[model samples]
Target: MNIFEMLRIDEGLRLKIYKDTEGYYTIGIGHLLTKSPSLNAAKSELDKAIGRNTNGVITKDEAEKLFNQDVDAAVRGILRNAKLKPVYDSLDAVRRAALINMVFQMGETGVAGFTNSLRMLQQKRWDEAAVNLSKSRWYNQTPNRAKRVITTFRTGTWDAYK
Candidate 1:
C-alpha cells in the first residue's frame, strides 16, 4: 500500500472533506490542510526533524532527509541480519549503494525477503544481480529508477549512474 493508504488506514479515512478537531481542514486520509495551523505545526516539527522550514509541506528537500534516514536505517538493519548483512558489507560501494537504493525504495526487511535477488547480491555477481533487479516487481513498478541503479550495479561505477 502507498503512504497515503497507510495514513488513511492508521488515521481513519474520511469519506468527505471536513474540519479536523484542531480547526484544520482535512480530507481523504486525514491530510491536514496546508494553510491551517495544525499542518503548520506539523511542518514545524518536520523542519526540526530535517533542519529545514518545510512551510507546511514536506517539500522535496525534507523528503530527501526522510529517504537518507530510511536508507541508513535499512543499512543498519542489514548489518544485523546474519545472512544478508555479511554479504552486504563485503560488496563494493556501488553495489552497496544499489542495495541501499533498493531498501530505500522498499525497505531492508521487506525487500530482502526476495532472496533470489539477495542471493545474487550476496555472491557479488553483478550481471546476475542486475538481471535479478531488473526482473523484480520493484523494477516493473519503477523501471526508470531501476534501470539507473541496476546500471550502476552492473558497471561498478557511479561516473554517470549516480
Candidate 2:
C-alpha cells in the first residue's frame, strides 16, 4: 500500500513527523529521527524503524537527539499544501510513492525548484523527465536514489538497482 495510505494523517500511528533536533526535517517513529542520523547510522536505524508498528519505536534516550516538533509541523504543513495532485494523478502507485518519497526527502522548495523536470513531465516528455531528473542537483548528490526514483517514474515499478 502507499505510505500515505499506510500512515494516514488521521489514523495509522499518527507518527507526528517532525524536524530533527540536529537541524533537518524527518519522519519520527517513536523518538528516532528516521532519516537524519549520520548516514550509516541513519540507514541502520531506519531499516529497523520502518518495520515497527507502534509509537516510541525509538526512544529519545536511545537516539542521539530528539526531533523539533515545530519544524516538523511546518514541513508537514508545506507538504499538505503542495500542488501534488497533478503528479499524483498522472502516475501509478509505485511512481506516485517514489515522487512522494522524493518530495519528503527534498522538501517542496527543492522539488518545485526542478523546473526542467516538472516541465518535461507536464509536456508528456517521459524520456526528458528521466533525463532531467538524473541531471538534477539531487542526482549529483544521490545518484542511486535519483536513479531509483526516475526509473520508477518511467516504468511504474520499483525495480531499479534491484
Candidate 3:
C-alpha cells in the first residue's frame, strides 16, 4: 500500500550480497553497496545483524534499515528539486507515493527528465501523464512495474498487491 511495501515487492529481497541488474554490488532490498553513503557502516550493520563478521549476509531488520535509508535519500532527492516542488506538493498521498517510487527506481534526475509527464501530473491530467510515462525507456525496461506505477498515478490509488 505504501511506497515501502510497493518497493519491497518490486525490488525483491536478498539476505546476501549479489550483483544488481546494472551489475552494482547490491544486497538486501536492492541496496547498492558500492553506491551506499557509508559502505563500511552498511557492512558493519550486516556483521552485527548476523552476530559476527561474515562474507555477505544481512538480517531482515538490517535490510529494512538500509531500505529506509535508500528511501530517505530518494525522498530528499525528490523534494529538493525546485522544478518539481510545486507539482509534488500539489499531489495526493497515492500520487506522491508513485512519484517516490519513480525516484527510487530511476533517481531524481531520471524522473525529473519526465518533463511532459510531470507537467501532466501537476495539471491533474491523469491520462496524459500515464501516456507520457508509457513512452519512456523506463517503461520498456520494466513494463510490469511501470504499469503499476502508471496506474497509481492515473487512478490516484495504491496498485501494489501483497
Candidate 4:
C-alpha cells in the first residue's frame, strides 16, 4: 500500500477538528493545529488549505491535500536527517515506509532519539531493531501502531500482505 493509505489507517481520517491522544486540537490525518508552534498561524494555514472560512470543518479533498503535504514533510524530514538518511537508504520500500511512519507519528527528532534502534536498523539487524523499538515509551503509548511498523521493519513486507 502507499504511504498515504498506511498513514490514514494509522492516524484515522477526520475532516473535522477533534482531540488527539494528547487532547490537542487536531484535524485531518493527525494534523496537530494546536500543537503547532503558533496555533493562530496553523489555523490560518488550515483555513487557506480548505479554501475559505471553514469554521471547524474541512472537505475530503482538503484533508487529502493536507495529508499529502504532511507526508511530504515527513519524507523530507527523514531525508534531511544525517543519521536517518543513510539508514533509510539501506531499507527497502516496506522498511522505508515503516521508518517514514515512525517519523510521521513522532517527528524526526523523536525518532532520532532512538540511537540504539537506528544503529540496529543500520546494521540490518531487523530483529534487534524491532525489539529495540518495542522497549520504548512510544511503543507503550501506541502499541498497535508501533507493532505494525516494527513488524514491517522485521519482515520487509507490507502490513496488508502480512
Candidate 5:
C-alpha cells in the first residue's frame, strides 16, 4: 500500500493509528510516545527532530533520539531486509521516505516488511504493489492505514507534498 493508505489520512484515523502503532505520534522530537507530557509537548519534540540546523537538513540523530536502541535497531532491520532491499532501490525518495516511516512505526516484521510487496515494488507494478500492500500484516493489523497508503501508491500522487 501507499503511505496515505497506511496512514489512513482520508478516514481521519491518523491519531488513533498513531497511538496504536507508535504508542504516540509526534511532529518533531524522538521517543515522544513514552516521554511526551502532552500532545503539544510531543509536537515540540518532533519539531526539534525535523528542523534543519546550519546544514538545512534534519539528521537521523535528531529524529531517532526518542527511540531506544532496540526500537531503532528494529527499524533499521526492516529497512535492511533482503526482500525489501530491491524495493527500496526502486522507489523515488518520497515513496522511500514514506515506506521507511511506515516500517519504523509498524516494526520490522509487520506489513511493511512483506516479501511480496517488496517484490512488487521492485518490479514497478503499481497495481500489484497496491495488492501486495493490502495483503500485508499491517493491512490486517491496521486496515484503515493500509487502504490509504495503497491508494496513494496506486495513484502516484506521492509527490504532492513535495
Candidate 6:
C-alpha cells in the first residue's frame, strides 16, 4: 500500500489536534509545532511537508522518503558554496558523506561558515580539516557525532565513524 494510506491506517489520522507522546502541540496527522526553523531551503521543504500533513495525513514512509531527499539536498547545499563547489567532486563518496552529516545538523550555509574547516578540505588537507572541525561550535554542541564524522573524513573509510 502507498505511504499516505498506510500511515493513516497505522499511525491513524487525528485531524482534531492532539499532543504527541513527547508532548508537542500538534494538529492534523502528526505535525510538531515547536521545531526551530531550519537554516536551508531544502529542510524547510520537509518542515512544510509535515505541516501539510496536518491536513493531508501522509504516510510514515512518505515522511521518511521526503526526509531522505532533504538529506541529499543538504549534502548538495554543503558543497554548493563557491569555495567547496569546485573541488567537491574531487573527494570520494566517503569523505563527502561525513560532510553531509555535518551539514545535515548544521545546515548547508551554516556548515560553510566553518571557514577554517572548509579551507582545509578544499586544500585537500584531511587531517587539518578534521582537527578544525573538532575545535568549533559544531563540535562543542555534538562532540560524539563530530568525532564520528571526522573519523570517516580523515581516514576515507566510512567504517571508521560510528
Q: Tell me, by TM-score, which candidate is best.
A: 4
Badly placed stretches (over 4 Å) of model 5 are 1-79, 111-113, 159-162
- Flag the better candidate by lDDT, 1 or 6: 1
Candidate 4, residues 1-162: lDDT per residue as tens digits?
A: 877778888999888777788767789899877665555656676687667988778888888888888899999989999989998888788888888988988889999899999999989998988898899999898888888888888988885434
**For this target, which candidate reaches the highest lDDT against the unseen true structure?**
4
lDDT, residue 159, candidate 4: 52
How do the residues 1-162 of candidate 5 rate in per-residue lDDT, one tens digit apiece?
443333333222222113434455432222333345365555554455445321222344543343334345544675687766566677786567556556655555664446677777777788988886776566787776566566656765663333
TM-score of each: 0.59, 0.53, 0.84, 0.90, 0.51, 0.63
Q: Model 5 TM-score?
A: 0.51
C-alpha RMSD between model 1 and the true structure: 11.0
Candidate 2 accuracy as TM-score: 0.53
Q: In candidate 2, which residue pairs get closer than 3 Å at backbone N, Cα or C atoms, i.e. clash?
A: 30-56, 30-57
What is the C-alpha local distance difference test score of candidate 4? 0.84
lDDT, candidate 2, equals 0.54
Candidate 4 vs 6: which has more lDDT: 4
**Better by TM-score, candidate 4 or 2:** 4
lDDT, candidate 4, at 67: 83
**Model 1, range 26-64, lDDT digits (tens) per residue?**
443344444456655554554566566545444444444
Write the number of the candidate with greater lDDT, choosing between 2 and 5.
Answer: 2
The C-alpha local distance difference test score for the whole of candidate 6 amounts to 0.58
lDDT of each: 0.59, 0.54, 0.81, 0.84, 0.53, 0.58
Q: Any runs in candidate 2 off by more than 4 Å, and if so which? A: 1-83
List candidate 3 segments past 4 Å from native: 35-54, 160-162
TM-score (C-alpha, index-matched) for candidate 3 = 0.84
lDDT minimum window of 10 residues, candidate 4 = 34-43
Which has the better TM-score: candidate 1, or candidate 6?
6
Distance from true location, Cα of 134 in model 6, Å: 0.8
Q: Which lDDT value does model 5 have at 88? A: 67
